[PDB]
């Protein structure tokens, strides 16, 4: 008995969406989802506003879903205050129209999001946990939403158990095309292994080529944007340097069947949750011009079950502030001339990347070792974060003797510190040599067995270790 | 409320110009990109209070703001105004105005903050951020007492309502624009500004049109920011209502402005502010406490409510006597202990929410404060910390707030004037706290 309007913008099949919702048992809701799969050509948004109380006249619609194009953020600025004037609807939205618009009127009632931009910074901290390539500079223009961003980032980085410290933040508004030699002077303050960048992508095709001509082309591949700040992931222009960092949102993933599978099912169960602790629901309307006087019934304590109700174990609680508290991000390294390349899967603000090592674009000398106090002290990692402290370095341990079917690495990391550890760190500071520190498996300083050597000598006779 | 039109203009970046609103929420140009102002917002009158700061050279306010975006923008405006005189005048009784306080709008007169204003001896009430609950503010003000002397009463033009006019005392000062004929005269002036804008536009280079066909033609109409820069270049000399050219955000930029005073329940005009020229009238200064005097500055008397925390050997405590007094105990020399009362912590015997108990309070502290009170001739009051801790600047995870924990946050908020303790000296404390010479030397 639920007035549901399904509106279509795009090219994907809607029938593959139909069985995405027709497969669930509808007996768990005790009220029938009456969906209405309507198509919609990409047309005038004022005609879409007319279409809103056209489909209200088609059926008393309480819940909507509407697929959307991926390049419509001004229309995302359009739709929300129309709702806050008149409706309490729900969309994903779709694509670029799912931009994080955190406007303050609570009567808009949209969940236009996944995670927030600040939640994207939060999982960017787990990226920082993964690579340990430091942030010393932060670059942005006047992109509204930056002061709270840098304040949250400073407040997090001042509460660390690690050696992570920030040195530079940069505000330079660059419509203003005269300030390219200013960035040539600002090369000194952008010397970081990892730099955060938040600008306008329309300006950034000029700005990134400017920064490449500044002398920052070698760091030009090591720059961070969210996928909303980034351009279209297919056919990215080459003024951006290749192999950049992708953060936020998904189309090659939970898709147009799956988003409406979140979708209507989330709506119908939330309504049944209003039928579960209140046993009621107010009636929807059909006369949008005149029923805007009839929003007296919109004492919306239903927003509790809007933001809190999950479905079938998938954590689907939301925040009313403009984000979802539960994450599903996307792959972390975008490629530019070629397509996105699937590298990272996100869950519980935690990354799954099947690499154990991260390259970039003088050599990593592979070094096997052995625990011996007070020289080599090997301890566990910080269990609040899984990594090492300020004066501590990771070390790579894997035992595959009990492995019988998948007899292969998959190293645990351990923390490592001690006397000679600081010595070899000083050597790596002097001769600028990177390394591959890992542990031994069999034999302390393993003896000669019929000519053959085990232990650390085994790694150097099999050339698995050049230094040890 | 005109945003269904102006945001559609913002779809095509065509400018829109306010003629009848001072709502500062529309001044957010990060959302209202298309908006410009022939009428300045609500916040712009707050800066005029800073130009009040040299009238009788006042330097100290107590300020309570109802929690609004306009009020917070006014807070940012006055914080921008106050951060000055980085040198290198040096008699510095300048606007270090003592206070800022928050208030939940729409609530009622359960404000003990009025009594907290009564504890500070300030000569001001000056500003709130409403006009309808301001009559309730007047009721709560006359409830204890604020209508008499020792308080100056000042409002702006959007603080004025008949209910407020039912309870504003004769002597409160209002600051009003010259804005009555704006429906005709400033309308003609604003279309004279757009006449100058099109006189620049027609003698400009190749500029595209905002063509026929609406929002369905989703490409944004390139000449939008071109029209914005055309309006940025417009400079009107003078109009009927008086005109100074635009600001950096396209504002009206007044100096067409008047000051009135409520007397005989009417707003008699006392002077005109013109840009920098505060030109007062020939009228007398009526103030509701019985002036025609100049009560500049605030009175500075005190009963020194000093806080302290129990710490041996500096502080010792005994519970009480049967009368609530203390037992007369002698030293090894027969001298009395001279224990002050030291009304202790509420929720004493910690973990149990009991009441305060007047102690028997001794150590170095009572002898030192008796010596100081006989030195400076200072009346005082004893207070005890219920927390039992010195305090660190804990970053509260709610909105990233580094607040000094414990009693140090209380004296930061002015719950006490000073503290005697084994006071550890740190760099972070000295950025907020005045310190004296080190009374003790240890390690």
């Amino acid at each position, epitope marked *: 008995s639920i007035g549901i309007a399904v509106i279509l913008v795009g090219t994907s099949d809607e029938v593959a969406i139909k069985d995405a919702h027709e497969k669930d048992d509808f007996h768990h809701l005790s009220v029938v989802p009456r969906v209405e799969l309507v198509a919609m050509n990409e047309t005038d948004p004022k005609s879409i506003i007319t279409r809103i109380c056209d489909l209200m006249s088609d059926r008393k619609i309480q819940g909507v879903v509407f697929a959307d194009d991926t390049d419509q953020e001004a229309i995302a600025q359009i739709l929300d205050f129309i709702s806050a004037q008149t409706l309490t609807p729900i969309l994903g939205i779709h694509g670029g129209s799912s931009m994080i618009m955190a406007d303050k009127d*609570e009567s808009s009632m949209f969940f236009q999001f996944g995670p927030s931009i600040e939640q994207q910074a939060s999982v960017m901290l787990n990226i920082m946990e993964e690579y340990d390539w430091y942030i010393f500079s932060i670059v942005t223009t006047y992109f509204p939403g930056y002061q709270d961003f840098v304040n949250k980032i400073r407040s997090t980085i001042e509460n660390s158990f690690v050696g992570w410290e920030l040195e530079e933040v940069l505000l330079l508004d660059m419509s203003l095309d005269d300030g390219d030699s200013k960035i040539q002077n600002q090369l000194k303050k952008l010397q970081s292994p990892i730099i955060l960048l938040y600008c306008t992508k329309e300006e950034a095709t000029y700005i990134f080529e400017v920064a490449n001509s500044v002398g920052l082309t070698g760091y030009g591949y090591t720059w961070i944007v969210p996928s909303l700040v980034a351009g279209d992931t297919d056919t990215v222009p080459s003024e951006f340097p290749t192999g950049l960092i992708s953060v936020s949102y998904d189309e090659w993933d939970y898709g147009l069947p799956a988003r409406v599978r979140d979708g209507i099912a989330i709506i119908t169960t939330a309504a049944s949750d209003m*039928l*579960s*602790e*209140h*046993s*009621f629901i*107010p009636e929807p309307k059909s006369s949008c011009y005149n029923t805007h006087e009839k929003r*007296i*019934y919109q*004492s*919306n*304590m239903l*927003n*509790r079950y809007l933001i809190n109700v999950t479905f079938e174990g998938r954590d689907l609680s939301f925040s*009313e502030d403009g984000y979802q508290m539960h994450p599903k991000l996307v792959i972390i390294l975008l490629n530019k001339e070629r397509k996105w390349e699937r590298v990272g899967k996100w869950k519980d603000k935690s990354l799954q990347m099947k690499y154990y090592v991260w390259p970039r674009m003088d050599d990593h000398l592979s070094i096997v070792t052995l625990e011996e106090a007070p020289f080599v002290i090997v301890e566990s990692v910080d269990p609040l974060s899984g990594t090492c402290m300020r004066n501590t370095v990771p070390c790579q341990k894997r035992i595959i003797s009990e492995n019988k079917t998948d007899e292969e690495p998959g190293y645990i990391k351990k923390c490592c510190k001690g006397f000679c550890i600081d010595i070899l760190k000083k050597i790596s500071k002097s001769v600028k040599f990177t390394y591959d520190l890992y542990l031994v498996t069999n034999g302390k300083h393993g003896k000669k067995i019929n000519g053959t050597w085990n232990g650390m000598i085994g790694e150097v006779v099999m050339k698995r270790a050049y230094m040890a | 409320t005109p945003t269904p039109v102006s945001y559609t203009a913002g779809f095509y970046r065509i400018p829109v110009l306010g003629l009848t609103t001072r709502m500062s929420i529309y001044s957010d140009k990060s959302i209202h990109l298309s908006f410009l102002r022939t009428v300045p917002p609500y916040s712009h009158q707050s800066s005029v209070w800073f130009e009040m700061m040299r009238v009788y050279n006042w330097n100290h306010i107590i300020l309570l703001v109802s929690d609004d975006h306009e009020g917070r923008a006014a807070q940012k405006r006055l914080e921008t105004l106050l951060e000055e005189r980085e040198s290198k005048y040096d008699n510095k009784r300048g606007p270090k105005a003592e206070k800022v306080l928050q208030f939940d709008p729409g*609530t*009622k007169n*359960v404000t003990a903050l009025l009594m907290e204003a009564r504890e500070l001896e300030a000569r001001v009430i000056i500003l709130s951020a409403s006009e309808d609950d301001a009559a309730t503010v007047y009721r709560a003000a006359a409830m204890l007492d604020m209508t008499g002397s020792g308080y100056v009463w000042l409002v702006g033009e959007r603080e004025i309502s008949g209910n407020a006019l039912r309870y504003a005392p004769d002597g409160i000062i209002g600051l009003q624009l010259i804005n009555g004929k704006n429906e005709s005269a400033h309308i003609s002036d604003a279309v004279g500004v757009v006449a100058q804008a099109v006189h620049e536009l027609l003698e400009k280079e190749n500029i595209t049109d905002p063509p026929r066909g609406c929002v369905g033609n989703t490409n944004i109409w390139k000449t939008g920011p071109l029209f914005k820069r055309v309006l940025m270049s417009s400079k009107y000399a003078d109009g009927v209502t008086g005109r100074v050219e635009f600001n950096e955000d396209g504002d009206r930029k007044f100096a067409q402005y008047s000051i009135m005073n409520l007397q005989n329940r009417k707003l008699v005009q006392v002077g005109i502010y013109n840009g920098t020229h505060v030109i007062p009238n020939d009228r007398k200064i009526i103030w509701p406490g019985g002036e025609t005097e100049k009560p500049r500055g605030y009175q500075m008397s005190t009963r020194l409510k000093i806080v302290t925390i129990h710490q041996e050997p500096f502080v010792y405590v005994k519970p009480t006597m049967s009368d609530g007094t203390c037992k007369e105990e002698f030293t090894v020399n027969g001298d009395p202990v001279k224990k002050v009362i030291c009304t202790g912590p509420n929720d004493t015997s910690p973990g149990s929410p009991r009441h305060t108990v007047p102690q028997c309070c001794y150590g170095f502290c009572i002898d030192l404060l008796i010596k100081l009170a006989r030195t400076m001739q200072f009346t005082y009051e004893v207070h005890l910390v219920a927390d039992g801790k010195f305090g660190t600047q804990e970053r509260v995870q709610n909105s990233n707030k580094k607040e000094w924990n414990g009693m140090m946050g209380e004296l930061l908020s002015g719950q006490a004037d000073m503290i005697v303790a084994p006071l550890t000296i740190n760099n972070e404390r000295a950025q907020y706290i005045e310190f004296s010479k080190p009374f003790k030397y240890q390690g």
Partner: antibody, heavy 117, light 112 residues
């Protein structure tokens, strides 16, 4: 404007049909209920019912005992009360639900069902 | 549930005073629609009535004696200058979940 009737003296464990006539509005746009005010001066909800006599709610002690019903054209509420206890000497009302659907919009003085021995 | 205590019930306060009632719930009911909580009034013999929609915002007919506020679990509901014609029982409790835990019974007495 709102009048509850149809009470009487029923035995413990017995049944009756309470009733209500309300005037002032159309019934198909407003929820209705049945309220219990015990002589021990604590309140309870007997039942509640949708605008069309559809979605109801019966509380935990109610869910073996009582049954609400509502005519949406004729201004009549009925309440079949079976398997009563000794504490069912309460004053029973109906109220004219709120615009959120919960609290009330106005009230009626109500009748009394006496359940004693 | 939203289980609340009404202190002091059966409270006797002299005339023309601030009769403040503390209401201590088990869980919170605050939202962006200014409250959830809703209250009550009846006199003995007189029909039951409502007193508070959500807050000091009242419906109609209630005099300016009352002023109620509070949030979460706490509700300070004061009556400014009190008189002896409203000395009766009020203040229903309820939960936004389906068991609407009524009762409490704040009987008003006047120190006559």
């Amino acid at each position: 404007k709102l009048q509850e009737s149809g009470g009487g003296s029923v035995k413990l464990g017995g049944s009756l049909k309470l009733s209500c006539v309300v005037s002032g509005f159309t019934f198909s746009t407003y929820y209705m209920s049945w309220v219990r005010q015990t002589p021990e001066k604590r309140l309870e909800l007997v039942a509640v019912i949708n605008s069309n006599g559809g979605n109801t709610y019966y509380p935990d002690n109610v869910k073996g005992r009582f049954t609400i019903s509502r005519d949406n054209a004729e201004n009549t509420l009925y309440l079949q009360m079976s398997s009563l206890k000794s504490e069912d000497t309460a004053l029973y009302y109906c109220a004219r639900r709120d615009y959120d659907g919960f609290a009330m919009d106005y009230w009626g003085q109500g009748t009394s069902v006496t359940v004693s021995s | 549930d939203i289980q609340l205590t009404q202190s002091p019930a059966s409270l006797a306060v002299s005339l023309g005073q601030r009769a403040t009632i503390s209401c201590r719930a088990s869980q919170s009911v605050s939202t962006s629609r200014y409250s959830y909580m809703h209250w009550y009034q009846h006199k003995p013999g007189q029909p039951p009535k409502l007193l508070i929609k959500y807050a000091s915002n009242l419906e109609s007919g209630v005099p300016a004696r009352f002023s109620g506020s509070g949030s979460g679990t706490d509700f300070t509901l004061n009556i400014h200058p009190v008189e002896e014609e409203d000395t009766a029982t009020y203040y229903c409790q309820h939960s936004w979940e389906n068991p609407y835990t009524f009762g409490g019974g704040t009987k008003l007495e006047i120190k006559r």
